[PDB]
Amino acid sequence: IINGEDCSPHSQPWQAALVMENELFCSGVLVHPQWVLSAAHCFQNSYTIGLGLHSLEADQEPGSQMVEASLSVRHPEYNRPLLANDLMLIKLDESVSESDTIRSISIASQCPTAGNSCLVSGWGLLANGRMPTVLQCVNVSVVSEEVCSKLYDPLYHPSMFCAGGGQDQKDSCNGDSGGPLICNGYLQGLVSFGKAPCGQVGVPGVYTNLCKFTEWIEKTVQA
């Protein structure tokens, strides 16, 4: 997260850390007690998932869990066309008893609208090029589909939307993939991709457009 700050502890209780050999490679979002959304480009044969976390380095905070997940499924149209349909569902090996610090979030029932006020969180690269130990949070605003399609020429697809791009240079970055973009209090997007470098003036980040996938997600959950 570029130009954010430490999140209030456990204020994003749906945040999931995806780690391998105890090293984060992506985030995800808890959407039901046994289901985590993430970017399809974060796909692995197995996962260790940190829930209820604030720090990655600290001793187990009260309420935190490290849970295994051995099953996941990418959207059948991931990367067709390139970069599009960037989502997958990870099924936890055990359902989590939701608690004060581990809670699912519901997906937005409206598609993104320019001007929407959002929050993105994650443990990805900071403005200073370092990785944080503590979960970072920053505000970004949705821009119009036409802005997104111009900026991400030639690869814009309706499974994507854009947020950020402000003169404030607030953005997601490497390591933030799969994490939540919360707009008006609902899960609106997952961090997906952007231009390198992250945090350029006039260049928003790209997020998976979850409102387009609610049917697929719930069909998969119920199957």
Binding site: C26, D86, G124, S177
Partner: peptide, 14 residues
Amino acid sequence: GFCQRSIPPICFPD
């Protein structure tokens, strides 16, 4: 110049 924002990221010629 586009990168999928995992760590390490997945970057493309554009």
